[PDB]
Amino acid sequence: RTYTKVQKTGSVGRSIDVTSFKDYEELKSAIECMFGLEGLLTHPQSSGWKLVYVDYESDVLLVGDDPWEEFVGCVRCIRILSPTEVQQMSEEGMKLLN
Amino acid sequence: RTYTKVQKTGSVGRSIDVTSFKDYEELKSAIECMFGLEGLLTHPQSSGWKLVYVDYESDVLLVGDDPWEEFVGCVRCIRILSPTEVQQMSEKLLNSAGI
């Protein structure tokens, strides 16, 4: 498997060549157009939506933080989290702790 | 690997350039903003929140004891520990290996 999975709960998932996009602006925009989320993954100051990824160590990390070259190497799969899923994640951490 | 992971249970992880900070006060403030914990890791006495890290030798250690220069090259990842997670760390493997 050369292609990376892009998933959104309730949508049919997709597979992309992350490396073919050469930056996060290009990546994020393409993903927003694919799932009909125009402006939501490219505005952290207004939107509660997160574009996350699972890496080689199975860690859920936010897309954007790392140098692109590192990212392209670590990335195992991508997921779009809605403001609701982010709170569902928080509550599941509380379930884990209790 | 060049940036350091910052993690919190029930939260989406992050990655920071540890070197882009002059001191621990700066490191702690950035992490607090990123995870919405303003004043929890800086004043720990009244919070119980611990900012831990994993060094090159795979050891879990409290962030802030070592000279900043030393820390910078030893850190592998940072983890934010909530007061509950702290209590849970004591709990069972010693009784497993013993028996």
Swiss-Prot record, chain A:
Superkingdom of source: Eukaryota
Subcellular location: Nucleus
Residues covered by the PB1 domain: 1-85
Tissues showing expression: Expressed in the whole plant with a lower expression in leaves. Detected in embryo axis, provascular tissues, procambium and some differentiated vascular regions of mature organs.
Functional note: Auxin response factors (ARFs) are transcriptional factors that bind specifically to the DNA sequence 5'-TGTCTC-3' found in the auxin-responsive promoter elements (AuxREs). Seems to act as transcriptional activator. Formation of heterodimers with Aux/IAA proteins may alter their ability to modulate early auxin response genes expression. Mediates embryo axis formation and vascular tissues differentiation. Functionally redundant with ARF7. May be necessary to counteract AMP1 activity.
Domain notes: Interactions between auxin response factors (ARFs) and Aux/IAA proteins occur through their C-terminal dimerization domains III and IV.
Anything else known: Absence of the protein probably causes early embryonic lethality. Premature stop codons are associated with vascular defects.
Complexes and interactors: Homodimers and heterodimers. Interacts with BRX and the auxin-responsive proteins IAA1, IAA12 (BODENLOS), IAA17 and ARF7.
Family: Belongs to the ARF family.
Protein name: Auxin response factor 5
Organism of derivation: Arabidopsis thaliana
UniProt gene name: ARF5
Residues of the full protein shown: 793 to 890 of 902
UniProtKB/Swiss-Prot annotation, chain B:
Disulfide-bond pairs as recorded: none
Location relative to the cell: Nucleus
Residues in PB1 domain copies: 1-85
Signal peptide: none
Reported tissue expression: Expressed in the whole plant with a lower expression in leaves. Detected in embryo axis, provascular tissues, procambium and some differentiated vascular regions of mature organs.
Other noteworthy facts: Absence of the protein probably causes early embryonic lethality. Premature stop codons are associated with vascular defects.
Family: Belongs to the ARF family.
Assembly mode: Homodimers and heterodimers. Interacts with BRX and the auxin-responsive proteins IAA1, IAA12 (BODENLOS), IAA17 and ARF7.
Annotated function: Auxin response factors (ARFs) are transcriptional factors that bind specifically to the DNA sequence 5'-TGTCTC-3' found in the auxin-responsive promoter elements (AuxREs). Seems to act as transcriptional activator. Formation of heterodimers with Aux/IAA proteins may alter their ability to modulate early auxin response genes expression. Mediates embryo axis formation and vascular tissues differentiation. Functionally redundant with ARF7. May be necessary to counteract AMP1 activity.
Name assigned to this protein: Auxin response factor 5
Protein species of origin: Arabidopsis thaliana
Portion held of the full protein: 793 to 894 of 902
